Scaffold this active site. Structure first.
Site, PDB file in Angstrom:
ATOM      1  N   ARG A  91      15.275  80.653  -3.623  1.00  0.00           N
ATOM      2  CA  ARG A  91      16.425  80.469  -4.493  1.00  0.00           C
ATOM      3  C   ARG A  91      17.217  81.762  -4.592  1.00  0.00           C
ATOM      4  O   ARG A  91      16.673  82.861  -4.449  1.00  0.00           O
ATOM      5  CB  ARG A  91      16.008  80.005  -5.898  1.00  0.00           C
TER       6      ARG A  91
ATOM      7  N   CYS B  44      23.762  79.241  -8.670  1.00  0.00           N
ATOM      8  CA  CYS B  44      22.603  79.498  -7.828  1.00  0.00           C
ATOM      9  C   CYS B  44      22.381  78.384  -6.826  1.00  0.00           C
ATOM     10  O   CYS B  44      23.019  77.334  -6.889  1.00  0.00           O
ATOM     11  CB  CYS B  44      21.339  79.663  -8.662  1.00  0.00           C
TER      12      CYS B  44
ATOM     13  N   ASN C 104      21.146  76.430 -13.654  1.00  0.00           N
ATOM     14  CA  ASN C 104      22.022  76.144 -14.785  1.00  0.00           C
ATOM     15  C   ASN C 104      22.694  74.785 -14.619  1.00  0.00           C
ATOM     16  O   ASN C 104      23.243  74.478 -13.558  1.00  0.00           O
ATOM     17  CB  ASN C 104      23.062  77.263 -14.899  1.00  0.00           C
TER      18      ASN C 104
HETATM   19  C1  LIG Z   1      20.742  79.852 -11.343  1.00  0.00           C
HETATM   20  C2  LIG Z   1      21.701  79.570 -12.424  1.00  0.00           C
HETATM   21  O1  LIG Z   1      22.820  79.157 -12.194  1.00  0.00           O
HETATM   22  C3  LIG Z   1      21.235  79.855 -13.812  1.00  0.00           C
HETATM   23  C4  LIG Z   1      20.720  81.280 -13.968  1.00  0.00           C
HETATM   24  C5  LIG Z   1      20.357  81.693 -15.405  1.00  0.00           C
HETATM   25  C6  LIG Z   1      21.509  81.381 -16.357  1.00  0.00           C
HETATM   26  C7  LIG Z   1      19.013  81.079 -15.841  1.00  0.00           C
HETATM   27  C8  LIG Z   1      17.974  81.039 -14.689  1.00  0.00           C
HETATM   28  C9  LIG Z   1      16.581  80.964 -15.352  1.00  0.00           C
HETATM   29  C10 LIG Z   1      16.862  81.017 -16.852  1.00  0.00           C
HETATM   30  C11 LIG Z   1      15.780  81.547 -17.788  1.00  0.00           C
HETATM   31  C12 LIG Z   1      14.453  80.811 -17.630  1.00  0.00           C
HETATM   32  C13 LIG Z   1      13.394  81.369 -18.579  1.00  0.00           C
HETATM   33  C14 LIG Z   1      13.866  81.311 -20.029  1.00  0.00           C
HETATM   34  C15 LIG Z   1      13.900  79.869 -20.547  1.00  0.00           C
HETATM   35  C16 LIG Z   1      14.342  79.771 -21.992  1.00  0.00           C
HETATM   36  O2  LIG Z   1      14.412  78.389 -22.393  1.00  0.00           O
HETATM   37  C17 LIG Z   1      15.688  80.436 -22.171  1.00  0.00           C
HETATM   38  C18 LIG Z   1      15.644  81.887 -21.705  1.00  0.00           C
HETATM   39  C19 LIG Z   1      15.212  82.059 -20.234  1.00  0.00           C
HETATM   40  C20 LIG Z   1      15.033  83.569 -19.975  1.00  0.00           C
HETATM   41  C21 LIG Z   1      16.265  81.466 -19.255  1.00  0.00           C
HETATM   42  C22 LIG Z   1      17.667  82.064 -19.434  1.00  0.00           C
HETATM   43  C23 LIG Z   1      18.690  81.550 -18.412  1.00  0.00           C
HETATM   44  C24 LIG Z   1      18.203  81.768 -16.976  1.00  0.00           C
HETATM   45  C25 LIG Z   1      18.048  83.268 -16.668  1.00  0.00           C
END
Ligand SMILES: *CC(=O)CC[C@@H](C)[C@H]1CC[C@H]2[C@@H]3CC[C@@H]4C[C@H](O)CC[C@]4(C)[C@H]3CC[C@]12C
Ligand SMILES: *CC(=O)CC[C@@H](C)[C@H]1CC[C@H]2[C@@H]3CC[C@@H]4C[C@H](O)CC[C@]4(C)[C@H]3CC[C@]12C
Ligand SMILES: *CC(=O)CC[C@@H](C)[C@H]1CC[C@H]2[C@@H]3CC[C@@H]4C[C@H](O)CC[C@]4(C)[C@H]3CC[C@]12C
Ligand SMILES: *CC(=O)CC[C@@H](C)[C@H]1CC[C@H]2[C@@H]3CC[C@@H]4C[C@H](O)CC[C@]4(C)[C@H]3CC[C@]12C
Lengths: 310, 315, 310, 315
Positions: A17, A1, A81
């Site tokens: 973003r 991202c 991430n």
């Molecule tokens: C942008 C990037 O590279 C990462 C994207 C994904 C993997 C990330 C982005 C936001 C994340 C959420 C945030 C809210 C919760 C936080 C909890 O601690 C874990 C679950 C959660 C849904 C995250 C998962 C990964 C996530 C989608």
């Protein structure tokens, strides 16, 4: 991202973003009102009269888990991430403001009105991790932006002069990597000579040759730092929303460009933004480039329940 | 600028172009119905029952100057800038079909149904550059394709070149022979996740997706835009629905779009993707969005009385 | 392989080549005197009093097969692999000066005293091929240089403004490819700013970033065209020999860099040069960087037999 | 500048450096025999029977300032420029071994026999920057290695960093952590002949050798020189004879040499590889050639009475 921040001529905030992944997490625009009562996980403080915040988030348990959010005063924060480099403690520490990782975006948007207050408070903050999310954070307002990288050696609060954030590796690497491309320009290439050979450009763009085009993390940072730094300044909301969405589109992940370890393709599933001049959140998805808008003045902010609009 | 062509599983045509420039010419979605009477400039022959065509362009002397257009049978053509290489005669050649440069996109759309029909007739065709009184000489090459394949028509000082476009993509200068020799440099880039290896004792791994794609250029110059969009079009997984294919077209073209501030022209202004147009033969619909608005607007052949006798220009 | 040509302040010739391959062909310095009688294969003409020539060559049958040679008047010619693009006729043509491919270097050095005479005569020349060697030729003197590419569409005589030749593809490609790198400079990178970020160079070389470093044919052409065009002009023999050998060393093939289709590694087995100011041939090998010299005034040029010194 | 280290099948040491600069300092091959008496600046402890060392450097106040040197047991060290990152204290620290910056290459060569012995002692070492009266402050990092492995010693404002150099190569700025993260970008380049593939319908092939290596940078900047010479050192096939190994050293270093006119310094002059020095532990011999002369000259430890008491400087 990718994280992008810039301002107009009046110090307003523009923050946005991309979210590159394979599957959707059920992301929805989540509005957290000020009358909504929040119980911090590790007993962290906060403002007496909280700030109304808005962004994209899921509603796990009864807590807003914001992927990216902004408040009514111009502050915004997004998480990206950072695996293989992020490292948190799993036990709280006495004497510090203990915030869990998932509550960290909602925490800073609820209580703080500027990036200066964030960098000041972070000196006494412990990020506790209760697969776990290994992230760093891109925080900015209408003046500057900062990067928060919690690693096994401590917490680093970098001042982000290019107003741009990307995944791995560390921020010190990306800033050093930018020096490899300092000669790339947006000027039309000046006719030169290599001996008796006169070299001219076919057209515009030759002066920009050198910028990578792959969607890897270090190369996306370089390409979007260039676009953000060279995009001419705008002085109205319509153009600055176009600027933010076009700047982010320059590093978008198109289906088929690169797989993951699971075998699926990385795709920019959605692109969210925020403008403090209008206190509005913008968002489009991979399957619909139409830019939908969600204003703060259209929701009851003194209400007491999270509203998740579809 | 960039032209893109691909197809779904049923053999329909998906065709689109990016128009990169610093100012607009007043272009618009242009309807040229079957009942419209076109008196060709140099007496070029046409179909008995002409094809109804749709596309983007302007009107001048009651003649549709198409930037790009397509007909009701899934054949599309677009004109891209090619100065310093394109060269045209300014007199018609007796014994051959004489089509002016500005009428070329209109001409192939009205009278032809497939690329095979097209490629055959070019053997007896002469593009004649007629300077429009108030405008400049247009030095273009053209990108033609259908639901099966695509060709490139480059008319230079040494005659006409008609290339079989295997990568189904076209940009600006230089010649199509350069772009295809240039692709051999980036033959090693891969969309696979990078394979962990080792350099002596050091073990290298990838931070994530995209490392195997390292090497693809990212500047907006004509050759680099060619390499990048050729990789994107070739590696996009084939779609089966119309909404998914329209998404593939505008996203493949988005991979080489020109953002404001990226590169200045030879006159001091920035080159921006002014608009992006597309066409689908599964529904006979033209699609278009602008730099100021990413909302993909649709214009279908069925929403216009195609047996009318006059040009319909919709804003 | 790579061909390089340049001149000093007095119009003298400096000409040199690398030879990249897996095995040695028994290359040796071959001196062809003027009193040596040569019988052209297809009955081609020539000067009455031939020019003494020197270079690297094998002695197949009783004919000097020069890889690269120069004559006593400052003209030099080298041949480089051009497979997949070179295409010759296998039958002579009446009314033209018919020269076989293997005799072509010895032909032009024996009879011609300048590049202008070569470009003039080539209008009435047929290159006949009697595995066959598919080559193009790099010819130059103390003024300019030309490239001779015989393909299935005819013979192309390109004017070489960068004074540099490399293998495939065609010369028109390499010249068009150079325009991608017109902004690369040898100046020290000027400090610039990307937004609030000030970018400075670690040291010299950042302005040259963009030049490829791989040993492929199109990328070697770009790197050696840059070096030759930016190398400051010298005014004595010692420096210009160093210039030619250093310019050629910038595109050398080191063992291990790239294999062939046979599986062996491409290595610059030797590097030959020539100076018209002293009428001397220079050469070193991969196993010995010492620069050996072979002067024309040390061999009997009015003799009548090829001398192959080891 | 670039330092290189590798080994043959018997475990000997092959070590070499490129000195890139715009002017000379009067360097020369310097002999420091075992009988020479060195009074360290800050009281650093030394070996009982010190090692006889050989290398390239100058003499100042009757003290050998080595640019690079090696001893009779196959241990070598070289100092490379590291300004803007190197930071040293200017006072000795009681309780630790205090070695000045200029004496560091001499100090590790006289008193140590292996990299393991070295790496252990750095745990109690403080490099103190003593400004030479007539010269400037030398902000260097060092490249140490033997017939087994190599390490990098970077002393910055946050303390000493001692990295295990897995790629066995060192350049200038920035920190060693950047160079090794930077290598992950070029993890896909291969010395294998490029494999014919296809992009849609277009079939791409290589003109010849080197296409699989596409992506390796070719400029003479410090990071790019690191990537290139790390690929060359890692892919060079291991040799077994001395002449073949000496050829590998001077050819690996030749892959990143700086040719006159390639890049100007911050003062207007060109950076050129002034000389290239090397060392072999199989024969205990130092090798060196200059920009004006590629003839590899040899200087063996056996050709000098190493039980003498004075510095021998040979031109
Ligand atoms: C942008 C990037 O590279 C990462 C994207 C994904 C993997 C990330 C982005 C936001 C994340 C959420 C945030 C809210 C919760 C936080 C909890 O601690 C874990 C679950 C959660 C849904 C995250 C998962 C990964 C996530 C989608
Ligand atoms: C996208 C790109 O490469 C830039 C090409 C632009 C400038 C070209 C493409 C189509 C052109 C039209 C075609 C219709 C008429 C033809 C007349 O001869 C000249 C005027 C005209 C409107 C062209 C102007 C340039 C044009 C938009
Ligand atoms: C530089 C490059 O890439 C090609 C190197 C090799 C393959 C070339 C260079 C010179 C060639 C000689 C020239 C003399 C004769 C000519 C005959 O027609 C064929 C045999 C011959 C020895 C050539 C073989 C290939 C060759 C060594
Ligand atoms: C190759 C490179 O990166 C450039 C580094 C050059 C300029 C360095 C390397 C070794 C240095 C010597 C070391 C011995 C003394 C130390 C004194 O403190 C200063 C003078 C001295 C001769 C250094 C000068 C710079 C130097 C050659």
């Amino acid at each position: 991202c990718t994280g992008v921040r810039f301002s107009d001529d009046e110090g307003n905030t523009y923050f946005g973003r991309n979210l590159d992944w394979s599957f959707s997490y059920g992301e929805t625009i989540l509005v957290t009102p000020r009358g909504y009562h929040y119980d911090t996980v590790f007993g962290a403080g906060g403002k007496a009269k909280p700030n109304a915040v808005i962004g994209v988030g899921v509603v796990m348990a009864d807590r807003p888990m914001y992927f990216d959010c902004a408040n009514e005063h111009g502050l915004a924060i997004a998480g990206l991430n950072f695996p293989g480099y992020a490292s948190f403690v799993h036990e709280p520490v006495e004497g510090t403001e203990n915030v869990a990782t998932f509550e960290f975006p909602l925490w800073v948007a609820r209580n703080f009105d500027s990036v200066d207050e964030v960098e000041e408070t972070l000196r006494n903050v412990t990020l506790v991790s209760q697969q776990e999310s290994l992230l760093h954070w891109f925080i900015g307002d209408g003046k500057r932006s900062i990067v928060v990288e919690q690693m096994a050696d401590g917490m680093h609060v970098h001042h982000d002069d290019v107003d741009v954030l990307t995944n791995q590796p560390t921020f010190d690497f990306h800033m050093e990597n930018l020096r490899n491309y300092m000669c790339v320009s947006n000027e039309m290439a000046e006719p030169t000579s290599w001996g008796k050979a006169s070299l001219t450009a076919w057209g515009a763009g030759v002066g920009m040759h050198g910028i990578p085009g792959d969607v890897s993390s270090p190369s996306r940072f370089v390409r979007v730092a260039y676009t953000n730094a060279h995009y001419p300044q705008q002085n109205d909301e319509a153009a600055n929303v176009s600027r933010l969405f076009h700047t982010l589109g320059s590093v978008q992940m198109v289906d088929g460009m690169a797989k993951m370890g699971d075998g699926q393709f990385e795709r920019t599933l959605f692109t969210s933004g925020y403008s403090s001049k209008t206190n509005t959140y913008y968002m489009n998805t991979y399957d619909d480039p139409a830019i939908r808008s969600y204003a703060m003045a259209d929701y009851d902010m003194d209400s007491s329940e999270l509203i998740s609009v579809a």
